[PDB]
């Protein structure tokens, strides 16, 4: 897993949870860690 996308900040933003699409360095949220993906976590 790597990390190259919009980083995170705080739940919310226009959808509900914090989602960052793109290379995600396993945030421990998606679990499978599909690196490039719009992940989420809180709300």
- In the chain the first and final C-alpha atoms are separated, in Å, by 24
In the chain, which ranges are E strands?
A: 4-5, 22-23
Number of domains in the chain: 1
CATH for 14: 2.30.90.10
Q: Which two tokens stand for residue 6?
A: 């919009």
CB neighbour list of residue 2: distance below 8 Å, 6 or more residues apart: 23, 25, 35
Method of determination is NMR
Give the separation between CA 26 and CA 18, rounded to whole angstroms.
14
Give the separation between CA 12 and CA 9, rounded to whole angstroms.
9
| Half-sphere exposure (Cβ direction) of 1: Cα atoms closer than 13 Å | 15
Q: Which domain holds residue 29?
A: 1-43
């Amino acid at each position: 897993c790597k990390y190259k996308f919009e980083n995170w900040g705080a739940c919310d933003g226009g959808t509900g949870t914090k989602v960052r699409q793109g290379t995600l360095k396993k945030a421990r949220y998606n679990a499978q860690c599909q690196e490039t993906i719009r992940v989420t976590k809180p709300c």
